């Protein structure tokens, strides 16, 4: 049993040990599954795939590796972090053999990047159940196609009863800029560039003129700038004050979505964009923000006080608001005949000179994702947050070997798991004179301490905690 | 005192020595500034920051380091150039102690990439005042927020009374393609690819048919091509002849802008695009061109002959026109019931297989900019022109040390500043038979010589000089 965090200089080493229980899935069978087997009639929801007797270990969320204090200690004192190494151990096998193999060639479908439940519990005293491994493949409706694949995980050599080197990724930037993209200027000095201040002398006929003025401290909106904010794909704006929302169903009809092969997937969470404008936190994008859930909440149709809605507002300096248009583009040629016109731009892709911040990571949220293997990508960093990797922590597949032919003995296994990660850090060099914003607990008394068990012994994490507190210059 | 230029092989070394004067700013105080202290009502122009007693040296414009005869000698003979080293000196101090320090860790805000006035003068016999340092931080209206920063520059160690290495950047491309993106084809040969020439036989009912044809010299617009022009964000079209322009005020209302945290900002200069179509020199994008003032031009509401409007028409080979749509897309599925529908693309983001030319640099324009420190960016080359750098030449701060408590002695300083940049060159290898276009003075007689003093001794620059004269193949 090893649980503790070694804080040494520019690096951290976190260790987590948990106890688990592994059942027998599908009565040791592989089974084809599709929406026909499920019962869904929708095309957007159609799927075809296979369920397996194997389980797998998912440590892909931060709260697995970090206590609430280790997270507080990380996010207040550091400008960046990223994983280096991993050491997965499995021991104290107890059966009532066991096969385990890691997929290091990435030859199976990779399901660890989809943000599924089944992680090691955040509180070390919990005992967790290993989730079942399954995967999907190509489909026409619920039917398959000649290009679909079938994977027998028995055909992989497994050990009957390791260490990993993370590939180089950029530091996750756990900080919030203390400047904004449009305000980078010296407030005291004029630019040498000119802009077109006026197009007509006065009221009347035939008044056209061109008057130019100097861009300066008095009018900052018209100054020349070297860089522009990142891309936008607009989301619908929902208010947490329900009387301010429209009296109609618009959750799916009004949502932003993308379409692939005729199937419409919701755009979730989507591009990295600020959740809301300054001063309005009662609004949140429809699919824009990662929505967690409070302990003991329930699966379907929970109220708003039963969820934790995360906000990205810290990136409103470099990133456009998710519920607002990107800007305006001139839509015609003016002339003596026609007035100049401009149109709202809802979505804007990459232009040269754009800068943006990625989505924040949370104690509860995912760590890494797997970059798909394709001829192209742009900025592979994943959209739910975390570190994108072509060859990420391998999947660790485990099952119970059957003991008897469909007649077998009802049997399960249990044991211990330890995973240890080394995290490289980036220290805060700031010369800021006045004190930083920090993540702190509130002194005011309460029935229960936060991030702690209650009188029934149920651990819970009260609010989502972002990584962005310290500041940098833009 | 060193001023000269050494032309050696593929390198150029340009030394410049200027005399300066440093007053006492803010009565040695750090004074809060916002739009309230100015009185600005408008929301787009709201700001919050601080003004400091410190000055700074801005050599960031090309005419600091290049004489007109050195600049001609550069742009006629060379395809590309870029800085290598920097050597700065401050000497012959005359105080009527003086503190100076470079910010080599970039721990202060960086105000040099904003194209402010206050550069080392273009003509060496001038004496220049040193501009005041100030910086903006986060705001809500005129109020600050907890995330705003305060920087005391006394909290930086300074010398009381350096060399620099430029980071690797691409050559600025001084040339204009002698081919166009859409004409790269062989004019004598047919392609082996077919296009759809005819969808009907003739006028009548139920005439639908499909006829395919070889693409070749006869019809060149339909041929298949491997690349496409750069991205576009449309600008309004203003005319220097004012009788085409509309008799309405469209300077702010009709301009392309981008919005960040609820505040709109004019898109200036914006993505690099050709200024006007071939044959039309009288049009210019509303906010898409750099506009310089002529010598002695006032600050407010000058006419169109007092300013020098640069144009990008060299890049019309690989780039779309700023005042035109990028192209058409289909907006519907045709059928017997539904006719073909197309829309004109006003803004187009990056697509795979695009090519473009960046914006040109001028004798009067900026050299480098600082890339904002962010999780991501695309094509960091700055939009006003020049060399984008993550570690640009550091800021150099200077002030008079106060001699006395609010009661001090009125005191100012002066001295000499010598700056030396080592520029790397790329020679013109072209096999073109006929002679190039060059930059020339005009032999025709005039009252004064261009780029020289008048009878009152006032140095002035007659026209903006672009860098692109020599040609290349596409």
């Amino acid at each position, epitope marked *: 049993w090893h649980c503790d965090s070694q804080w040494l200089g520019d690096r951290v080493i976190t260790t987590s040990t948990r106890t688990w229980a592994l059942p027998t899935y599908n009565n040791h069978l592989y089974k084809q599954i599709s929406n026909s087997t499920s019962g869904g009639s929708s095309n957007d929801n159609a799927y075809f795939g296979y369920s397996t007797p194997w389980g797998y270990f998912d440590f892909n969320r931060f709260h697995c590796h970090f206590s609430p204090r280790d997270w507080q200690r990380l996010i207040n004192n550091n400008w960046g972090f990223r994983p280096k190494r991993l050491n997965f151990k499995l021991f104290n096998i107890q059966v009532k053999t066991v096969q385990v193999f890691t997929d290091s060639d990435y030859q199976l479908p990779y399901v660890l990047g989809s943000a599924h439940e089944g992680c090691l519990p955040p509180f070390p005293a919990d005992v967790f159940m290993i989730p079942q491994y399954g995967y999907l493949t190509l489909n026409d409706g619920s039917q398959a196609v000649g290009r679909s694949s079938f994977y027998c995980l028995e055909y992989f050599p497994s050990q009957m009863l390791f260490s990993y080197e993370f590939e180089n990724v950029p530091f996750h930037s756990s900080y919030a800029h203390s400047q904004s993209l449009d305000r980078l200027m010296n407030p005291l000095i004029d630019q040498y560039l000119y802009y077109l201040s006026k197009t007509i002398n006065g009221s009347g006929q035939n008044q056209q003129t061109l008057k130019f003025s100097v861009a300066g401290p008095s009018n900052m909106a018209v100054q020349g700038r070297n860089y522009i904010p990142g891309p936008s794909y607009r989301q619908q704006r929902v208010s947490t004050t329900v009387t301010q929302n429209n009296n109609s169903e618009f959750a799916w009809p009004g949502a932003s979505s993308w379409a692939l092969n005729g199937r419409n997937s919701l755009m979730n969470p989507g591009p990295a964009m600020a959740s809301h404008k300054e001063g309005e936190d009662r609004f949140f994008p429809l699919s824009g923000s990662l929505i967690f859930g409070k302990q003991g909440t329930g699966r379907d149709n929970v109220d708003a006080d039963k969820v934790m809605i995360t906000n990205e507002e810290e990136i409103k300096t470099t990133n456009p608001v998710a519920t607002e248009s990107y800007g305006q583009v001139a839509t015609n040629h003016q002339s003596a005949q026609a007035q100049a016109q401009t149109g709202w731009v809802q979505n804007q892709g990459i232009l040269p000179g754009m800068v943006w911040q990625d989505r924040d990571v949370y104690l509860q949220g995912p760590i890494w994702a797997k970059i798909p293997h394709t001829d192209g990508n742009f900025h592979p960093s994943p959209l739910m947050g975390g570190f994108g990797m072509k060859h990420p922590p391998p999947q660790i597949l485990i099952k119970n070997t059957p003991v008897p032919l469909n007649s077998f003995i009802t049997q399960y296994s249990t044991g211990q798991v330890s995973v240890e990660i080394e995290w490289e850090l980036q220290k805060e060099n700031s010369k800021r004179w006045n004190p930083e914003i920090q993540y702190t607990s509130n002194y005011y008394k309460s029935n229960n301490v936060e991030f702690a068990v209650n009188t029934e012994g149920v651990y819970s994490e009260p609010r989502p905690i972002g990584t962005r507190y310290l500041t940098r210059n833009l | 005192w060193h001023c000269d230029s050494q032309w050696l092989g593929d390198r150029v070394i340009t030394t410049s020595t200027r005399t300066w004067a440093l007053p006492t700013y803010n009565n040695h105080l750090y004074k809060q500034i916002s739009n309230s202290t100015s009185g600005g009502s408008s929301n787009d122009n709201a700001y919050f920051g601080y003004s400091t007693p410190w000055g700074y040296f801005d050599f960031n414009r090309f005419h600091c380091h290049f004489s007109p005869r050195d600049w001609q000698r550069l742009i006629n003979n060379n395809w590309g150039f870029r800085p290598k080293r920097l050597n700065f000196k401050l000497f012959n101090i005359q105080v009527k102690t003086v503190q100076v320090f470079t910010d080599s860790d970039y721990q202060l805000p960086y105000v040099l990439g904003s194209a402010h006035e206050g550069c080392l003068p273009p003509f060496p016999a001038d004496v220049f005042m040193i501009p005041q340092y100030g910086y903006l931080t986060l705001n809500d209206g005129s109020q600050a927020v907890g995330r705003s920063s305060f920087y005391c520059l006394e909290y930086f160690p300074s010398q009381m009374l350096f060399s620099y290495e430029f980071e690797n950047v691409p050559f600025h491309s001084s040339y204009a393609h002698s081919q166009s993106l859409d004409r790269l084809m062989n004019p004598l040969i047919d392609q082996y690819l077919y296009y759809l020439s005819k969808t009907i036989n003739g006028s009548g009912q139920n005439q639908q048919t499909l006829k395919f044809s070889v693409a070749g010299p006869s019809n060149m617009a339909v041929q298949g091509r491997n690349y496409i022009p750069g991205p576009s964000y449309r600008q309004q079209r203003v005319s220097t002849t004012v009788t085409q322009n509309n008799n309405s005020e469209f300077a702010w209302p009709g301009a392309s802008s981008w919005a960040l945290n609820g505040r709109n900002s004019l898109m200036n200069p914006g993505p690099a695009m050709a200024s006007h179509k071939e044959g039309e020199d009288r049009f210019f994008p509303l906010s898409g061109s750099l506009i310089f003032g002529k010598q002695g031009t006032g600050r407010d509401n000058v006419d169109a002959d007092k300013v020098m409007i640069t144009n990008e028409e060299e890049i019309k080979t690989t780039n779309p026109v700023a005042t035109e749509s990028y192209g058409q897309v289909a907006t519907n599925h045709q059928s017997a019931q539904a006719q073909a529908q197309t*829309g004109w*693309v006003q803004n187009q983001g990056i697509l795979p297989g695009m090519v473009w030319q960046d914006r040109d640099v001028y004798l009067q324009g900026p050299i480098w900019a600082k890339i904002p420190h962010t999780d991501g960016n695309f094509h960091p080359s700055p939009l006003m022109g020049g060399f984008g750098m993550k570690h640009p030449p550091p800021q150099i701060l200077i002030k008079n040390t106060p001699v006395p408590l609010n009661s001090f002695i009125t005191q100012y300083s002066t001295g000499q500043v010598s700056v030396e940049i080592e520029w790397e060159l790329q020679k013109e290898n072209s096999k073109r038979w006929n002679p190039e276009i060059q930059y020339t003075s005009n032999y025709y007689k005039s009252n004064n010589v261009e780029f020289a003093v008048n009878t009152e001794g006032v140095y002035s620059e007659p026209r903006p000089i672009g860098t692109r004269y020599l040609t290349r193949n596409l």
Partner: antibody, heavy 127, light 109 residues
């Protein structure tokens, strides 16, 4: 495919008032300027008025004959164009067409270069 | 306010090209104009709009035998192949920010 239907036409005494309505389809009504034109029987087209888009302001323009008698209204939510007629004249009787603005209409950074006439509605003002 | 003038009526025999003139007022010369045809019993059909330069944007549903061109302050419409199916009032319209103006119509036969 853009479709424009009109309604509200019929018989009204020379003194009186009537409303016409135009329900747009297949076009982004919020982003487009609309127009009313009328054609007296056996006579050529004659323009009535326009209604600018919300972004450009909801202001409306009117032809010199019908100025001050008629109003144009729009209901973005219901995607309908309205023409309110008051103080009629015998000469007013025309087929009233609902037409989109000839320059075009630009929605979400895409422009459309072509014009779509309505179906038409006959209005006979007589007693 | 612009003033659109055009011929009262003009006809042509089948299989031949007919040209139709629409004259802009002076000082409105540069304005862009659009052509509409109206069948004797039907709602008008947008044909195309032509600039002073001679560049024109043809409709989506329109045959290729329609085309137009312009001299100074003088606009044209050319029906290159005449099919019995199109003979109708051809209206010329022009627009300004303040108002929209129509021609008096040209009946083709």
């Amino acid at each position: 495919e853009v479709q424009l239907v009109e309604s509200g036409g019929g018989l009204v005494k020379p003194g009186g008032s009537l409303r016409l309505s135009c329900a747009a389809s297949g076009v982004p009504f919020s982003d487009a300027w609309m127009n009313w034109v009328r054609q007296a029987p056996g006579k050529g087209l004659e323009w009535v008025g326009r209604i600018k888009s919300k972004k450009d302001g909801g202001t409306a323009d009117y032809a010199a004959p019908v100025k001050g008698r008629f109003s144009i209204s729009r209901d973005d939510s219901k995607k309908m164009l309205y023409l309110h007629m008051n103080s009629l004249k015998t000469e007013d009787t025309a087929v009233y067409y609902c037409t989109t603005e000839p320059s075009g209409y630009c929605s979400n950074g895409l422009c459309y270069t072509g014009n779509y006439w309505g179906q038409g509605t006959l209005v006979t003002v007589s007693s | 306010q612009p003033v659109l003038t055009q011929s009262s009526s003009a006809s042509a025999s089948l299989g031949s090209s007919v040209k139709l003139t629409c004259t802009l007022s002076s000082g409105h010369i540069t304005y862009i104009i659009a052509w509409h045809q109206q069948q004797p019993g039907k709602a008008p059909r947008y044909l195309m709009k032509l600039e002073d330069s001679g560049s024109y944007n043809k409709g989506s549903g329109v045959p290729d035998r329609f085309s137009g061109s312009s001299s100074g302050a003088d606009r044209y419409l050319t029906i290159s192949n005449l099919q019995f199916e199109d003979e109708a009032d051809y209206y010329c319209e022009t627009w300004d920010s303040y108002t929209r103006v129509f021609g008096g119509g040209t009946k083709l036969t």
